[PDB]
Amino acid sequence: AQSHSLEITSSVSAEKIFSGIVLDVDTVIPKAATGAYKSVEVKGDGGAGTVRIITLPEGSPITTMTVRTDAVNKEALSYDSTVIDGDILLGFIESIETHMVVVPTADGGSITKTTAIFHTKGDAVVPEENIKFADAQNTALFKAIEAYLIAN
Template identity: 50%
Template sequence: MEVTSSVSASKMFKAFVLDGDNLIPKILPAAIKCVEIVQGDGGVGSVKLITFGEGTSQLKSMKHRIDGLDKENFTYSYTLIEGDALMNEIESITYHLKIVPSADGGSICKNRSIYHTKGDAQVTEEQIKAGKEKAIGVFKVVESYLQANPETYN
Protein backbone atom coordinates (compact mmCIF):
# COMPACT_ATOMS: atom_id res chain seq x y z
CA MET A 1 0.00 0.00 0.00
CA GLU A 2 1.26 3.50 -0.81
CA VAL A 3 -0.27 6.80 0.29
CA THR A 4 1.00 10.21 -0.81
CA SER A 5 1.05 13.30 1.36
CA SER A 6 1.93 16.96 0.94
CA VAL A 7 3.62 16.82 4.37
CA SER A 8 7.38 16.18 4.52
CA ALA A 9 8.63 12.71 5.38
CA SER A 10 10.38 13.84 8.57
CA LYS A 11 7.35 15.69 9.90
CA MET A 12 4.96 12.85 9.01
CA PHE A 13 7.26 10.25 10.64
CA LYS A 14 7.55 12.32 13.83
CA ALA A 15 3.78 12.75 14.09
CA PHE A 16 2.51 9.40 12.76
CA VAL A 17 5.15 7.09 14.26
CA LEU A 18 7.22 8.76 16.97
CA ASP A 19 4.35 10.67 18.63
CA GLY A 20 1.44 8.70 17.19
CA ASP A 21 0.59 7.17 20.59
CA ASN A 22 -0.16 10.66 21.90
CA LEU A 23 -1.37 12.44 18.76
CA ILE A 24 -3.79 9.90 17.29
CA PRO A 25 -5.94 9.46 20.44
CA LYS A 26 -6.04 13.28 20.68
CA ILE A 27 -7.24 13.85 17.10
CA LEU A 28 -9.25 10.61 16.69
CA PRO A 29 -10.60 9.87 20.21
CA ALA A 30 -13.65 8.02 18.86
CA ALA A 31 -11.37 5.57 17.02
CA ILE A 32 -8.42 5.22 19.42
CA LYS A 33 -9.12 5.81 23.10
CA CYS A 34 -5.55 5.33 24.32
CA VAL A 35 -2.20 3.66 23.72
CA GLU A 36 -0.11 2.42 26.63
CA ILE A 37 3.21 0.62 26.87
CA VAL A 38 2.63 -2.61 28.80
CA GLN A 39 6.12 -4.04 28.39
CA GLY A 40 9.46 -2.36 27.71
CA ASP A 41 10.56 1.26 27.38
CA GLY A 42 8.84 2.17 24.11
CA GLY A 43 11.71 1.01 21.92
CA VAL A 44 12.29 -2.18 19.95
CA GLY A 45 10.82 -5.18 21.78
CA SER A 46 8.24 -3.12 23.65
CA VAL A 47 4.59 -4.17 23.64
CA LYS A 48 1.80 -1.60 23.37
CA LEU A 49 -1.88 -1.97 24.23
CA ILE A 50 -4.17 0.01 21.93
CA THR A 51 -7.69 0.54 23.27
CA PHE A 52 -10.28 1.48 20.66
CA GLY A 53 -12.93 4.12 21.15
CA GLU A 54 -16.44 2.98 21.95
CA GLY A 55 -19.12 2.95 19.29
CA THR A 56 -16.95 3.26 16.18
CA SER A 57 -15.82 -0.34 15.96
CA GLN A 58 -16.68 -3.78 17.24
CA LEU A 59 -13.01 -4.11 18.23
CA LYS A 60 -12.04 -3.46 21.84
CA SER A 61 -8.25 -3.63 21.92
CA MET A 62 -5.08 -5.07 20.43
CA LYS A 63 -1.45 -5.48 21.39
CA HIS A 64 1.48 -4.95 19.13
CA ARG A 65 5.21 -5.46 19.55
CA ILE A 66 7.75 -3.03 18.10
CA ASP A 67 10.14 -4.99 15.89
CA GLY A 68 12.19 -2.18 14.34
CA LEU A 69 12.54 1.58 14.45
CA ASP A 70 14.97 3.60 12.32
CA LYS A 71 14.48 7.33 12.89
CA GLU A 72 17.04 8.36 10.26
CA ASN A 73 15.50 6.30 7.45
CA PHE A 74 11.87 6.77 8.59
CA THR A 75 11.13 3.05 8.94
CA TYR A 76 9.01 1.30 11.55
CA SER A 77 8.11 -2.37 11.90
CA TYR A 78 5.69 -3.91 14.34
CA THR A 79 3.67 -7.08 14.80
CA LEU A 80 0.05 -7.29 15.90
CA ILE A 81 0.27 -10.14 18.43
CA GLU A 82 -3.04 -10.10 20.28
CA GLY A 83 -6.57 -8.71 20.02
CA ASP A 84 -9.96 -8.75 18.36
CA ALA A 85 -8.50 -7.77 14.97
CA LEU A 86 -6.91 -11.22 14.65
CA MET A 87 -10.42 -12.78 14.49
CA ASN A 88 -9.23 -16.17 15.86
CA GLU A 89 -8.00 -16.99 12.33
CA ILE A 90 -4.75 -15.06 12.31
CA GLU A 91 -1.73 -15.79 14.49
CA SER A 92 -0.20 -12.34 13.89
CA ILE A 93 0.17 -9.55 11.33
CA THR A 94 3.55 -7.94 10.70
CA TYR A 95 3.66 -4.41 9.32
CA HIS A 96 6.64 -2.72 7.65
CA LEU A 97 6.20 1.04 7.27
CA LYS A 98 8.53 3.40 5.43
CA ILE A 99 7.93 7.07 4.79
CA VAL A 100 10.00 8.40 1.90
CA PRO A 101 10.42 11.97 0.68
CA SER A 102 8.71 12.77 -2.62
CA ALA A 103 10.03 15.10 -5.31
CA ASP A 104 7.46 17.79 -4.46
CA GLY A 105 8.61 18.12 -0.83
CA GLY A 106 5.87 15.86 0.48
CA SER A 107 6.13 12.18 1.26
CA ILE A 108 4.96 8.71 0.35
CA CYS A 109 3.99 6.26 3.07
CA LYS A 110 4.72 2.69 2.00
CA ASN A 111 3.24 -0.09 4.10
CA ARG A 112 3.59 -3.82 3.66
CA SER A 113 1.50 -6.22 5.75
CA ILE A 114 2.28 -9.90 6.21
CA TYR A 115 -0.51 -12.09 7.56
CA HIS A 116 0.42 -15.23 9.54
CA THR A 117 -2.73 -17.37 9.61
CA LYS A 118 -3.62 -20.23 11.93
CA GLY A 119 -3.69 -23.60 10.18
CA ASP A 120 -5.29 -23.33 6.74
CA ALA A 121 -7.28 -20.16 7.50
CA GLN A 122 -7.46 -17.65 4.64
CA VAL A 123 -7.50 -13.86 4.78
CA THR A 124 -9.99 -12.48 2.27
CA GLU A 125 -9.38 -9.57 -0.07
CA GLU A 126 -12.30 -7.85 1.66
CA GLN A 127 -10.55 -8.11 5.05
CA ILE A 128 -7.29 -6.78 3.59
CA LYS A 129 -9.12 -3.92 1.85
CA ALA A 130 -10.93 -2.95 5.08
CA GLY A 131 -7.62 -2.85 6.97
CA LYS A 132 -6.00 -0.71 4.26
CA GLU A 133 -8.91 1.74 4.26
CA LYS A 134 -8.68 2.20 8.05
CA ALA A 135 -4.91 2.74 7.89
CA ILE A 136 -5.24 5.26 5.04
CA GLY A 137 -7.99 7.06 6.98
CA VAL A 138 -5.78 7.48 10.06
CA PHE A 139 -2.85 8.61 7.92
CA LYS A 140 -5.00 11.23 6.17
CA VAL A 141 -6.35 12.55 9.50
CA VAL A 142 -2.76 12.98 10.75
CA GLU A 143 -1.89 14.71 7.47
CA SER A 144 -4.86 17.10 7.86
CA TYR A 145 -3.82 17.88 11.43
CA LEU A 146 -0.27 18.69 10.29
CA GLN A 147 -1.54 20.88 7.45
CA ALA A 148 -3.76 22.80 9.89
CA ASN A 149 -0.91 23.06 12.45
CA PRO A 150 2.22 23.62 10.36
CA GLU A 151 4.29 24.74 13.35
CA THR A 152 4.08 21.29 14.99
CA TYR A 153 6.70 18.53 14.64
CA ASN A 154 9.39 20.71 13.06
Protein backbone atom coordinates in the same frame (compact mmCIF):
# COMPACT_ATOMS: atom_id res chain seq x y z
CA ALA B 1 2.90 -16.51 3.34
CA GLN B 2 -0.05 -14.25 2.44
CA SER B 3 0.92 -10.57 2.11
CA HIS B 4 -0.46 -7.16 1.16
CA SER B 5 0.85 -3.67 0.62
CA LEU B 6 -0.65 -0.22 1.12
CA GLU B 7 0.74 3.04 -0.31
CA ILE B 8 -0.50 6.41 0.96
CA THR B 9 0.53 9.65 -0.73
CA SER B 10 0.87 12.95 1.10
CA SER B 11 1.95 16.51 0.30
CA VAL B 12 3.58 16.67 3.76
CA SER B 13 7.30 15.86 3.96
CA ALA B 14 8.65 12.43 4.87
CA GLU B 15 10.38 13.64 8.06
CA LYS B 16 7.20 15.32 9.29
CA ILE B 17 4.85 12.41 8.45
CA PHE B 18 7.15 9.95 10.20
CA SER B 19 7.23 12.13 13.28
CA GLY B 20 3.44 12.22 13.34
CA ILE B 21 2.61 8.57 12.64
CA VAL B 22 5.55 6.98 14.55
CA LEU B 23 7.68 9.14 16.86
CA ASP B 24 5.02 11.38 18.42
CA VAL B 25 2.00 9.15 17.78
CA ASP B 26 1.03 8.83 21.50
CA THR B 27 0.53 12.59 22.01
CA VAL B 28 -0.60 13.31 18.44
CA ILE B 29 -3.50 10.81 18.16
CA PRO B 30 -5.50 12.18 21.12
CA LYS B 31 -5.33 15.69 19.58
CA ALA B 32 -5.75 14.51 15.94
CA ALA B 33 -8.32 11.68 16.15
CA THR B 34 -10.02 12.57 19.38
CA GLY B 35 -12.46 9.62 19.63
CA ALA B 36 -10.69 7.00 17.49
CA TYR B 37 -9.30 5.14 20.53
CA LYS B 38 -11.15 4.24 23.73
CA SER B 39 -7.82 3.67 25.55
CA VAL B 40 -4.11 2.91 24.99
CA GLU B 41 -1.74 1.20 27.45
CA VAL B 42 1.86 1.83 26.38
CA LYS B 43 4.58 -0.39 27.87
CA GLY B 44 7.93 1.03 26.76
CA ASP B 45 9.55 4.15 25.28
CA GLY B 46 8.50 3.77 21.64
CA GLY B 47 11.57 1.87 20.43
CA ALA B 48 11.97 -1.88 19.85
CA GLY B 49 10.20 -4.03 22.47
CA THR B 50 7.49 -1.46 23.08
CA VAL B 51 4.05 -3.03 23.35
CA ARG B 52 0.76 -1.10 22.99
CA ILE B 53 -2.59 -2.50 24.14
CA ILE B 54 -5.25 -0.63 22.14
CA THR B 55 -9.04 -0.68 22.72
CA LEU B 56 -11.60 0.80 20.32
CA PRO B 57 -15.22 1.81 21.25
CA GLU B 58 -17.86 -0.80 22.24
CA GLY B 59 -19.63 -1.32 18.87
CA SER B 60 -16.59 -1.29 16.55
CA PRO B 61 -15.90 -4.21 14.12
CA ILE B 62 -12.45 -4.54 15.74
CA THR B 63 -12.54 -3.83 19.51
CA THR B 64 -8.99 -4.82 20.68
CA MET B 65 -5.47 -5.08 19.29
CA THR B 66 -2.03 -5.55 20.87
CA VAL B 67 0.90 -4.24 18.80
CA ARG B 68 4.62 -4.85 19.40
CA THR B 69 7.29 -2.56 17.96
CA ASP B 70 10.02 -4.70 16.38
CA ALA B 71 12.29 -1.93 15.03
CA VAL B 72 12.50 1.86 14.57
CA ASN B 73 14.96 3.74 12.43
CA LYS B 74 14.65 7.52 12.88
CA GLU B 75 17.28 8.31 10.23
CA ALA B 76 15.74 6.03 7.53
CA LEU B 77 12.11 6.75 8.41
CA SER B 78 11.27 3.05 8.77
CA TYR B 79 9.10 1.29 11.36
CA ASP B 80 8.48 -2.44 11.87
CA SER B 81 5.74 -3.78 14.13
CA THR B 82 3.68 -6.90 14.73
CA VAL B 83 0.05 -7.35 15.78
CA ILE B 84 0.20 -10.20 18.32
CA ASP B 85 -3.20 -10.30 20.09
CA GLY B 86 -6.80 -9.03 19.93
CA ASP B 87 -10.04 -9.75 18.06
CA ILE B 88 -8.30 -8.17 15.04
CA LEU B 89 -6.72 -11.62 14.62
CA LEU B 90 -10.20 -13.10 14.08
CA GLY B 91 -10.16 -16.77 15.08
CA PHE B 92 -7.05 -17.85 13.25
CA ILE B 93 -4.36 -15.26 12.46
CA GLU B 94 -1.28 -16.03 14.56
CA SER B 95 0.29 -12.62 13.89
CA ILE B 96 0.31 -9.69 11.42
CA GLU B 97 3.92 -8.71 10.68
CA THR B 98 4.19 -5.19 9.22
CA HIS B 99 7.05 -3.15 7.73
CA MET B 100 6.67 0.53 6.94
CA VAL B 101 8.90 3.05 5.22
CA VAL B 102 8.21 6.74 4.47
CA VAL B 103 9.95 7.84 1.27
CA PRO B 104 10.31 11.41 -0.04
CA THR B 105 8.99 12.59 -3.41
CA ALA B 106 10.41 15.16 -5.84
CA ASP B 107 7.57 17.60 -5.01
CA GLY B 108 8.61 17.78 -1.34
CA GLY B 109 5.88 15.36 -0.25
CA SER B 110 6.04 11.66 0.59
CA ILE B 111 4.76 8.12 0.01
CA THR B 112 4.20 5.92 3.05
CA LYS B 113 4.49 2.26 2.04
CA THR B 114 3.44 -0.54 4.33
CA THR B 115 3.82 -4.27 3.73
CA ALA B 116 1.75 -6.61 5.90
CA ILE B 117 2.45 -10.35 6.16
CA PHE B 118 -0.29 -12.54 7.64
CA HIS B 119 0.86 -15.63 9.54
CA THR B 120 -2.02 -18.09 9.82
CA LYS B 121 -2.56 -21.65 11.09
CA GLY B 122 -2.46 -24.14 8.17
CA ASP B 123 -3.69 -22.96 4.75
CA ALA B 124 -6.15 -20.43 6.21
CA VAL B 125 -6.54 -17.32 4.03
CA VAL B 126 -7.39 -13.82 5.30
CA PRO B 127 -10.36 -12.60 3.22
CA GLU B 128 -10.07 -9.57 0.94
CA GLU B 129 -12.90 -7.71 2.80
CA ASN B 130 -10.88 -7.71 6.06
CA ILE B 131 -7.78 -6.39 4.33
CA LYS B 132 -9.75 -3.60 2.61
CA PHE B 133 -11.27 -2.68 5.98
CA ALA B 134 -7.82 -2.35 7.56
CA ASP B 135 -6.63 -0.20 4.63
CA ALA B 136 -9.59 2.16 4.94
CA GLN B 137 -9.17 2.54 8.67
CA ASN B 138 -5.38 3.01 8.56
CA THR B 139 -5.80 5.59 5.79
CA ALA B 140 -8.49 7.36 7.84
CA LEU B 141 -6.12 7.62 10.81
CA PHE B 142 -3.16 8.62 8.61
CA LYS B 143 -5.14 11.47 7.09
CA ALA B 144 -6.46 12.69 10.42
CA ILE B 145 -2.80 12.94 11.50
CA GLU B 146 -1.82 14.63 8.21
CA ALA B 147 -4.48 17.25 8.97
CA TYR B 148 -3.04 17.87 12.45
CA LEU B 149 0.50 18.22 11.01
CA ILE B 150 -0.60 20.72 8.34
CA ALA B 151 -2.18 22.89 11.07
CA ASN B 152 0.63 22.58 13.72
